[PDB]
Design a protein around this ligand. Sequence first.
Ligand SMILES: Nc1ncnc2c1ncn2[C@@H]1O[C@@H]2COP(=O)(O)O[C@H]2[C@H]1O
Ligand SMILES: Nc1ncnc2c1ncn2[C@@H]1O[C@@H]2COP(=O)(O)O[C@H]2[C@H]1O
Ligand SMILES: Nc1ncnc2c1ncn2[C@@H]1O[C@@H]2COP(=O)(O)O[C@H]2[C@H]1O
Ligand SMILES: Nc1ncnc2c1ncn2[C@@H]1O[C@@H]2COP(=O)(O)O[C@H]2[C@H]1O
Ligand SMILES: Nc1ncnc2c1ncn2[C@@H]1O[C@@H]2COP(=O)(O)O[C@H]2[C@H]1O
Ligand SMILES: Nc1ncnc2c1ncn2[C@@H]1O[C@@H]2COP(=O)(O)O[C@H]2[C@H]1O
Lengths: 460, 460, 460
Amino acid sequence: MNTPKEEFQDWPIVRIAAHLPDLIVYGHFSPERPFMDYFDGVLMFVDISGFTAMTEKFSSAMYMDRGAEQLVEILNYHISAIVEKVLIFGGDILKFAGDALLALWRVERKQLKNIITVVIKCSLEIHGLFELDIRVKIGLAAGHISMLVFGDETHSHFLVIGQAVDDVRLAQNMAQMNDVILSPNCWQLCDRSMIEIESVPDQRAVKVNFLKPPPNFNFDEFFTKCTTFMHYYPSGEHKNLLRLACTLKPDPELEMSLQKYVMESILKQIDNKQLQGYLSELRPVTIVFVNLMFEDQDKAEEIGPAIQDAYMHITSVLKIFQGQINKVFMFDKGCSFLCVFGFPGEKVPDELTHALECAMDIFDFCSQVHKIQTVSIGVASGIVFCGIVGHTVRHEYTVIGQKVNLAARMMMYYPGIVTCDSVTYNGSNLPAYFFKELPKKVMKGVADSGPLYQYWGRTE
Amino acid sequence: MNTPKEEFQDWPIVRIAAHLPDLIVYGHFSPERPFMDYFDGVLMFVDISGFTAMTEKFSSAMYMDRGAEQLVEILNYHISAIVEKVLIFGGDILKFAGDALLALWRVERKQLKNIITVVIKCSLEIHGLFELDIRVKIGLAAGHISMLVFGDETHSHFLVIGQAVDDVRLAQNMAQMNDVILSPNCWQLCDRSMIEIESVPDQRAVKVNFLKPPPNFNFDEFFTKCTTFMHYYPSGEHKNLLRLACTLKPDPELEMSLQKYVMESILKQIDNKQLQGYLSELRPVTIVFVNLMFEDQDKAEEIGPAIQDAYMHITSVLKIFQGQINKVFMFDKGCSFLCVFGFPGEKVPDELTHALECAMDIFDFCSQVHKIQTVSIGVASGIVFCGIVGHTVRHEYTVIGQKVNLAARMMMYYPGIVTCDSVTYNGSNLPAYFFKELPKKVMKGVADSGPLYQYWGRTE
Amino acid sequence: MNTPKEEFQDWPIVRIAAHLPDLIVYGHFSPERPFMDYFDGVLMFVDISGFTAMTEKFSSAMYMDRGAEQLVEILNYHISAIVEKVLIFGGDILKFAGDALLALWRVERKQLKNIITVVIKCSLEIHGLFELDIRVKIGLAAGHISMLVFGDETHSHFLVIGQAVDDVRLAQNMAQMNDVILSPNCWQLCDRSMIEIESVPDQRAVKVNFLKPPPNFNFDEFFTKCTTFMHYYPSGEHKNLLRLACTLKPDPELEMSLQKYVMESILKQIDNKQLQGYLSELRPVTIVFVNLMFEDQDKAEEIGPAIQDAYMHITSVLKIFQGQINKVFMFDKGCSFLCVFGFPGEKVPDELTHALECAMDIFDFCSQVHKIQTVSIGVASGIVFCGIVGHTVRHEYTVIGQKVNLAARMMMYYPGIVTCDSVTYNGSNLPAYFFKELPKKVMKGVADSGPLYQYWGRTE
Ligand SMILES: Nc1ncnc2c1ncn2[C@@H]1O[C@@H]2COP(=O)(O)O[C@H]2[C@H]1O
Ligand SMILES: Nc1ncnc2c1ncn2[C@@H]1O[C@@H]2COP(=O)(O)O[C@H]2[C@H]1O
Ligand SMILES: Nc1ncnc2c1ncn2[C@@H]1O[C@@H]2COP(=O)(O)O[C@H]2[C@H]1O
Ligand SMILES: Nc1ncnc2c1ncn2[C@@H]1O[C@@H]2COP(=O)(O)O[C@H]2[C@H]1O
Ligand SMILES: Nc1ncnc2c1ncn2[C@@H]1O[C@@H]2COP(=O)(O)O[C@H]2[C@H]1O
Ligand SMILES: Nc1ncnc2c1ncn2[C@@H]1O[C@@H]2COP(=O)(O)O[C@H]2[C@H]1O
């Protein structure tokens, strides 16, 4: 009797699971919204620099209208290699945002010290692959982490929250190219007998210099000990897989739960109802970047109800005005929603007007949600890259472009108002007195923004 | 000199062959129609219960318009596992019908006894995989089998015929969930020293209790002996394949012959001229289920010419009225054609009227074909699942739905007339006196049919 | 720590590289046009006979509108096997033209003798696979070879040039079915102690009879020695691949260079923006076969500037009149461009008129380019097969059909004018006095051409 090969089965549930972390795939938590949970872990925030500028260059004539295809290929080639290292070192990729990603090693509190060594080693190997003018910067944090899941009956979103989350962002932002930086708490919890560091001027964070293993040390054996504490590390018969999620079996209840996190146009491609090619594009869109600031953004039980309330109105007005939520994350200050008008299927003239009216509506509503202290929204319009970024086994739809960065910076440097760029202002069919021309601010990461405006709105 | 890997070649002929049994793929018989051949074998009829009800539930809002995708995935996950067991035990899957399938072990007469043991073991392992409220029922028969091939210059269809065929259906219909039932002849021919059974009240068929191997028995060694008699069992260099048909090589004469069995829209997908996704759908259709009854339905030489004659008119009127033959099989009483109006590409309003006029035409013509004793047709309209069901190496296009079952039951419980359901009646643009409202019958497998009607037709 | 499988990555650059030889993929030469380089090598020209006639037959009703699909499958099955042998013996496939291909073993001059033995062995094994009424004929040449690359800022084309190139064509044209013929120079350079031959009446070329290895000879060991001189032979960790090009890594500069050789509609399919199926078709087109003759067609430095100049005008007028360059090669006499009107996306009525006006324009312009001695153009219209031919790892878009051959023969047998077939003449919307009915010539490879015409043009 034969024992024939089992071909890998690439069921729709497995293709769905590529777009999600283990934290959600194996989370089995309540469908109630907001849902909050609490755990401990180590966070790694990896940023490739230089892709934002490459994006502008891939629009030029030299790429012969295959700029989107060439961009996603070279990006995925590099990002895939980082993803592989994260996964092989036992991490869970939570989200991709442009040319960056955020990874988590969730463990019980007593194992944080040893897992931090693992993550530092991972980071140093990652820094290694990049010895294309592209550099990698890495921020690490460790400690208490909260998770929020918010959404409605057909869509779900998650976020991680708390000091470790704020810390990992602060750390990555101080990093110079090729630095691995540790949060203050990460450095207080780490195995100091092995991690040689250098102080960072005016900061309590530190920079990793090198690993200094002791005499009998064997990283393989140590790693193996750490894998006792890693619930989903592929092992035994599945030690040849990058993710346990590759073995997920059809299960309609689980699939119903997981698909709510994934955009409809992505589900269409998963379902072989649309060609793979059409989601990689360089196309004119409007970014609407919404920031909600709270009194205490480390306190999920306070902020979760507010984010949910805001989300319920945001999703509804986006639907009216033809926009979509591409990504949500916690900033240094606030919960941000990266919203996009014009992407795969949704398109118009008056797209600009709609973006601005939608922004004002979100501003007016969210400003009155309990516990939201300040709302800020930046609106910018131009050619941006849209596509699936990452590795075959772990990837997400994301946007990359100078206008994405400009909207984010606008929302940060002009808090409490709705701002737009010049493309949006000039292009909109709105009268000029609905706007106010603003003082020009020098903005981290922005060469020349062009004139900027506040959308003051219809009256006053 | 290198000896590089040969990648599996997934030629169009191999993709075609997935839709057909070895009986046709390696049959090399005459292109004349009708063509009849005669052999012996063991039949297995496997029915999954519960999918029909799942179908109705996958239309509900909870599935978020991915009901067809979710249904076919969970169905294929389960059906694939049954297919694998059948193939590994040496069987040939003849056809899929909804959530059921029919498999054949063709052997010389002296080997029936030993092959029945093989098939019983297979069935018990199948019953095993299912220890989703889904149960499996299995009917087994053995003896003389006839095959009919009928068709025209561009389409071919096959059927198996005779007492063993009637028996395998009777056996499966007495089975309670999880039973394996043997036909009377199967039980008379089997190795009684090993097969422990229980009598079935008012029946000569029996139910399998267990296998009772004797002292020196080794199933592997026994199976190996049986494989001497199995012409296409994958072996040697190809022992890692589920089917020898996976090695089929391009051959335009053979492909021309085999494609005649496969629907045009399936050939389009095989040819990479249409996306895979679009054939899985939950869509409103009309089923027209035609039953032809004969004086002796076990006698191919009598019934073959009649089926061919009926087929020639059916295919032509279906073409006029935009219908298609989805499946043909022998019932307990008769040769049935499962015909569908509205599926992938063919669609209209007046679809209902056309279904009814086509049905009446088929009824009038077939009632006058020599040797057809009675024609019965059931017409029902609703949402039905349409898609490719089975395993990657062996699968077919089929339909599943409560309206498929209702049409089949109508045709059986109201013989000699054309009947329709209420959806079809109310929806048709035909005057009401073309119909007659019928007494309601309690019908095996039908909760509440709604009012039913006879299509009496234009005059009388 | 796991070491998971790396799945083959089928990046867009690798899919591009399938359409090109190693000569271009790893050539890294100047973007200047014309670019010429010089080397030595052995050429093999392999022709399958019989596919041209199969093409006409795959249009017949028996193929049930899947003639293109069936044709490309059976062709690729056979051609793939020839490709594999060429690659495993260390050759580089330069181009496919219909059911023929041309392969190169580039080596330093001192190694020509031993490499010729390798190529003869390859050819004898190829002749072996074909012991479908299809025969294979092989011509071999060896010596100095020039390469020309010509083109503009977005398209590139290459050619090989010189006596060895002329010789390999002459040799293949004398071959009877199943012959392997050596050019005079090939026979003068080969290892005569091992290659037994037969003279060819009125020719200095010879025919291979057999290999006569000496006593201690071991082909494997000898082959291994020869692989020292083969720059890209897959080896070590990559000894299981048919081409090193299968390992190519994303590199936007390299991809920008390589894509210029590949048709836009092919790049669309590579990019998963169009279904694979649609490029295999049997469709009515017009072939415009342009031949440029030079005083000395073995002298790249003379002819390269002329071909470039001609190309610059040809590409521009083709664009106006909706045609495309499908292939370019050196004939016995001249550089020929195989141009096609009507293929995937480009289509009209007046297609015929346009083909003829485009032809006349090319004729008038190219006749005045310095060093072009004579221009000849044949225009023929009918159903031709268009599709990707070859192996998964090495294939190209090409056309096959009796009308392709007829246009080529017209251009050769009626030099110095523009000729057309009867389909083109009758179909064109041009007045009859724009033409001249020509004497009928018996033409190598042409049963009955129908009446032929000179397109005399508007005036005289
Ligand atoms: N896809 C994306 N998702 C989120 N942010 C992005 C994306 N592309 C660019 N950016 C932002 O650009 C911002 C600039 O400031 P930061 O680097 O602190 O934070 C950065 C990101 O939030
Ligand atoms: N693993 C360690 N344990 C104790 N001290 C350390 C360790 N690694 C680095 N140091 C540092 O030795 C450093 C010398 O450089 P700094 O001035 O940056 O700050 C000093 C300490 O922070
Ligand atoms: N795809 C299908 N093909 C044939 N029959 C079907 C299908 N789906 C449901 N049924 C029928 O529903 C019928 C009800 O009665 P039986 O179970 O005896 O026979 C059953 C099948 O013939
Ligand atoms: N393999 C066998 N050989 C002989 N008798 C059998 C065998 N298996 C079961 N029996 C049964 O022993 C059974 C006791 O249960 P029943 O009353 O169902 O019917 C009786 C016989 O049919
Ligand atoms: N795709 C093709 N490319 C080039 N030539 C072709 C093709 N199909 C048929 N032919 C030609 O038919 C010609 C007839 O003469 P030759 O055999 O000398 O050269 C042959 C080829 O050039
Ligand atoms: N390898 C070889 N070395 C020398 N002579 C050869 C060799 N192979 C064949 N011959 C031939 O012996 C041949 C006898 O046949 P021909 O008349 O064709 O021409 C003669 C020579 O060309």
